[PDB]
Nucleic acid binder design. Structure first.
Ligand SMILES: [Zn+2]
Ligand SMILES: [Zn+2]
Ligand SMILES: [Zn+2]
Ligand SMILES: [Zn+2]
Lengths: 81, 74
DNA sequence: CCAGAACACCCTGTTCTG
DNA sequence: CCAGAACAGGGTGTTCTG
């Protein structure tokens, strides 16, 4: 019953190594598999929350990285301990 | 040959009273009618240019109004 | 030439499947 | 539980129509 660490929406589980909602889970996967040459229109600190997370993919992706999301998370936990 | 005064894309003609591109023309009309209440994720001063105009409809719509865009101007 | 409508795509987020 | 795929919708921008 926790909150997505990236956007504070209703979290759905531990995804790519972090507590997140589903939207952030698929957003991160899409961002890492393509290019993430996104551009912030503000000052690289946009507020990423449930209604505003769509505004700035640049800052959203940055928060994903900063919370520790990574593709090999599940496979890394499966080497422990 | 010219420049949209809202997003700086190549403008297409005078729309709603102002030199704008086509995307800004239709954005503005949708903003006034659909009257969604948009919310900035920054500080209400986002850069509105070709690639970023889509990031912040609140600020884009503000820049539209500030450039003089107006529905009943014809 | 411009307003408005239609179309066509992208991005997103929910649901399905392995 | 959680990854990845599929599917459904909203916003955006170009083209079409009045
Ligand atoms: Zn989230
Ligand atoms: Zn940002
Ligand atoms: Zn424009
Ligand atoms: Zn803004």
């Amino acid at each position: 019953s926790h909150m997505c660490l990236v956007c504070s929406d209703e979290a759905s589980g531990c995804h790519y190594g972090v507590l997140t909602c589903g939207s952030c889970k698929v957003f991160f996967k899409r961002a890492v598999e393509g290019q993430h040459n996104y551009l912030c229109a503000g000052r690289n600190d946009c507020i990423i929350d449930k209604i505003r997370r769509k505004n700035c993919p640049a800052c959203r992706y940055r928060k994903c990285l900063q919370a520790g999301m990574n593709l090999e998370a599940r496979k890394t936990k499966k080497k422990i301990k």
